[PDB]
Amino acid sequence: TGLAADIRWTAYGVPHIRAKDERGLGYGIGYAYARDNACLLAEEIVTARGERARYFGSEGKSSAELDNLPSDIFYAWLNQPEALQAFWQAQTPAVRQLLEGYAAGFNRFLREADGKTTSCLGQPWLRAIATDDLLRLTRRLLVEGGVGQFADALVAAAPPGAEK
Amino acid sequence: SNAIAVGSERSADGKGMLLANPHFPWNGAMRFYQMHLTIPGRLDVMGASLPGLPVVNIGFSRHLAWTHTVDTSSHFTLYRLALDPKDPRRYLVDGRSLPLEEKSVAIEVRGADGKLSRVEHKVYQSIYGPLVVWPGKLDWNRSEAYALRDANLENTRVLQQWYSINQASDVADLRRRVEALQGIPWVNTLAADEQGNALYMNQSVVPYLKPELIPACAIPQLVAEGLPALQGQDSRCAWSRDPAAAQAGITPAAQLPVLLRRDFVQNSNDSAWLTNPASPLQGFSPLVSQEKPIGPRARYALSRLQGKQPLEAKTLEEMVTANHVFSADQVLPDLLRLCRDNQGEKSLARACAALAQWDRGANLDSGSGFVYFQRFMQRFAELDGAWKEPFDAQRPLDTPQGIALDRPQVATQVRQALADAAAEVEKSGIPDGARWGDLQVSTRGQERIAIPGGDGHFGVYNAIQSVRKGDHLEVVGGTSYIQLVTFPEEGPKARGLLAFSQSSDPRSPHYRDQTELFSRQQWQTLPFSDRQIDADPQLQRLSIREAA
Numbered sequence: 001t002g003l004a005a006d007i008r009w010t011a012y013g014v015p016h017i018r019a020k021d022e023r024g025l026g027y028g029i030g031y032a033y034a035r036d037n038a039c040l041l042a043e044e045i046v047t048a049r050g051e052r053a054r055y056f057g058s059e060g061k062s063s064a065e066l067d068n069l070p071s072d073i074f075y076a077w078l079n080q081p082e083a084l085q086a087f088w089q090a091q092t093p094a095v096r097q098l099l100e101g102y103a104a105g106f107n108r109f110l111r112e113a114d115g116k117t118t119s120c121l122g123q124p125w126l127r128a129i130a131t132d133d134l135l136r137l138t139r140r141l142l143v144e145g146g147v148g149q150f151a152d153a154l155v156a157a158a159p160p161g162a163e164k
Numbered sequence: 165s166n167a168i169a170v171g172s173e174r175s176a177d178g179k180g181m182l183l184a185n186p187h188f189p190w191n192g193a194m195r196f197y198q199m200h201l202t203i204p205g206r207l208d209v210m211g212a213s214l215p216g217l218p219v220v221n222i223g224f225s226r227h228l229a230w231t232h233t234v235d236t237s238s239h240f241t242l243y244r245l246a247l248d249p250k251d252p253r254r255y256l257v258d259g260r261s262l263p264l265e266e267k268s269v270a271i272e273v274r275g276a277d278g279k280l281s282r283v284e285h286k287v288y289q290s291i292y293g294p295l296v297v298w299p300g301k302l303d304w305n306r307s308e309a310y311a312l313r314d315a316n317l318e319n320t321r322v323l324q325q326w327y328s329i330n331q332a333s334d335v336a337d338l339r340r341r342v343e344a345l346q347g348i349p350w351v352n353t354l355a356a357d358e359q360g361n362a363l364y365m366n367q368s369v370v371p372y373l374k375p376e377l378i379p380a381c382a383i384p385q386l387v388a389e390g391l392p393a394l395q396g397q398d399s400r401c402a403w404s405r406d407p408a409a410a411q412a413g414i415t416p417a418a419q420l421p422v423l424l425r426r427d428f429v430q431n432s433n434d435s436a437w438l439t440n441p442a443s444p445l446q447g448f449s450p451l452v453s454q455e456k457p458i459g460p461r462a463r464y465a466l467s468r469l470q471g472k473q474p475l476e477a478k479t480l481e482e483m484v485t486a487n488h489v490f491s492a493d494q495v496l497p498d499l500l501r502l503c504r505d506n507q508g509e510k511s512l513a514r515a516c517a518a519l520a521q522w523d524r525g526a527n528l529d530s531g532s533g534f535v536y537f538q539r540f541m542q543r544f545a546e547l548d549g550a551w552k553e554p555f556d557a558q559r560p561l562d563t564p565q566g567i568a569l570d571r572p573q574v575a576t577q578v579r580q581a582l583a584d585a586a587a588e589v590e591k592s593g594i595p596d597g598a599r600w601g602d603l604q605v606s607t608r609g610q611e612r613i614a615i616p617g618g619d620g621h622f623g624v625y626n627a628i629q630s631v632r633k634g635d636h637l638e639v640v641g642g643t644s645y646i647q648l649v650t651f652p653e654e655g656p657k658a659r660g661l662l663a664f665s666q667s668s669d670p671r672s673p674h675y676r677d678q679t680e681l682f683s684r685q686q687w688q689t690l691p692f693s694d695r696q697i698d699a700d701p702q703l704q705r706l707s708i709r710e711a712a
């Protein structure tokens with residue numbers, strides 16, 4: 001109920017965010033990160049939503065060098081609505097507020113961006129984000145120590161036919 | 165990644181000191197970003213974070229600094245299923261036939277037309293998790309298949325965990341907060357505080373099996389090859405439950421390696437074992453920590469850290485900026501001897517010269533000896549019994565060492581590997597007298613910036629990973645966020661850089677400013693206090709708000 005942040009940038013564009021609560025703090029983080037890396041985050045959210053083949057077709061790859069379609073299959077499987085919902089409901093109020101603030105702050109920069117520090121201005125995949133998108137990234141990060149390393153292997157797993 | 169924490173018994177000022185040198189990608193979803201977070205009165209922390217996360221992952225606060233390295237613990241298990249002999253879509257648990265579950269996902273695919281079409285894919289799942297196939301190793305035939313259970317799928321505590329770390333006061337408090345929540349997914353944690361404690365924790369989310377279960381629950385041939393593979397046809401091979409664990413089936417905090425000392429702790433991605441050799445860490449589950457030979461980065465670090473001489477901040481910085489190729493110390497002397505024994509072999513002439521002039525570093529100015537050495541080592545690594553003194557578990561810091569040139573079969577093969585490597589290098593297009601900096605770069609728009617450092621597998625503490633792209637080696641990962649923190653009375657003194665700069669966008673004023681600095685290895689103040697922040701002549705400020 002009121003997002004506000006105070007941001008200072010020192011040399012090299014390092015942001016110092018001050019706020020009275022987690023929502024405000026997240027707001028400043030999402031705004032400042034977007035100023036530097038909106039296109040990066042937009043791209044990786046597309047990946048984590050399992051939508052690479054939708055925007056870019058089957059011949060391309062993610063920034064992890066997985067083919068777009070197997071990558072999409074894996075992250076669609078990983079980030080199903082039920083899994084995201086249970087993950088959210090297990091978050092503390094403070095963390096929910098951090099995340100709600102981040103999304104709002106990222107989206108504020110997008111609304112105002114005129115391309116000064118954003119090269120992908122106008123791209124259909126550069127769009128407002130939601131807290132679910134941040135959960136998708138978090139879960140994607142979580143499984144890098146596990147099933148994420150086997151993403152191709154998961155997609156390839158099909159039962160045998162009539163072979164001898 | 166490297167990490168070194170120094171305590172009151174070894175630091176020049178009698179207080180804590182921390183070097184953080186994570187090795188991570190230079191692009192994509194794991195690209196570090198610097199930021200300082202303050203809620204006045206209860207939160208004040210600075211460091212770097214990964215994209216999308218509203219917390220600091222590696223950083224420091226008023227009395228504390230902490231960092232991470234990828235650990236060697238397993239964070240998942242493979243399960244070998246015994247398939248129903250009548251139906252390869254069913255599997256046996258305690259002799260009972262269970263059906264695989266099928267989850268279908270649908271994907272939109274943009275075609276040459278620009279039109280979308282819908283693709284449907286079946287994901288097969290067992291009680292353990294999804295099935296996985298590695299053709300020729302983990303197949304799915306009429307007899308067996310493999311499922312994978314990832315422990316971090318149930319780790320809903322990861323964001324709370326770093327937010328809690330962000331609020332930690334000192335090392336004791338840091339340890340309490342990490343052991344209480346057990347939300348760290350797959351890294352070690354090292355830390356130092358003002359008071360001069362140095363902390364190592366192998367405190368992550370790790371599948372738990374009671375020790376009596378391990379001999380029969382393992383797949384012997386697969387674990388011998390490094391895979392955490394369990395027998396999936398036995399219900400007793402389920403992850404063990406322990407009420408003290410924060411999550412069902414993971415290892416309680418008390419059974420995970422922790423080392424709290426006042427001299428030092430270190431890690432360079434080996435196991436907990438030799439974090440500090442004066443106090444070896446042993447007796448843990450094989451899922452957690454094993455006594456394996458340490459890699460050359462850790463071997464290098466230990467060779468600089470051992471002893472009784474005080475460690476200054478400058479000492480830790482230069483362990484990174486020296487760019488010393490520590491692998492050369494084990495191999496190059498005997499290699500150079502073989503060269504002197506084979507003068508006149510014209511095919512070895514260029515190589516042996518280059519290796520002899522080489523400063524044994526991965527500096528911008530380092531000669532082509534590095535390139536010759538790399539290609540040789542890649543071949544040397546495939547030879548059998550070529551070490552003069554093989555790994556000795558009773559001398560883990562000093563072995564292996566040397567080339568077994570006294571054995572003719574080894575001398576012939578080493579010379580051949582040098583010949584092959586030399587041919588390979590000269591076959592490529594490396595100009596006369598090109599230096600390492602001429603070859604390894606990071607592209608920024610249509611310019612290139614020369615990048616010092618080399619692959620960690622050759623024992624360069626400043627680990628840099630590159631790939632061949634046209635006429636150069638393009639940096640893809642490695643040294644990334646650097647922070648070196650000390651604790652003078654005025655407040656935390658932090659020094660470092662973000663190697664690839666704050667922004668991934670070419671339009672940004674901060675696309676390459678720190679990268680130019682990384683090239684010259686000129687670390688900078690990381691301003692934390694209001695007085696440090698206000699003293700910066702580049703200071704900019706913006707306040708923003710909007711209704712909820």
Ligand SMILES: *[B-](O)(O)CCCCCCCC
Pocket residue numbers: 165166186187188214221232233234235351433
């Ligand atoms: B290094 O072991 O090569 C990489 C360590 C990075 C730590 C990341 C912490 C946030 C999840």
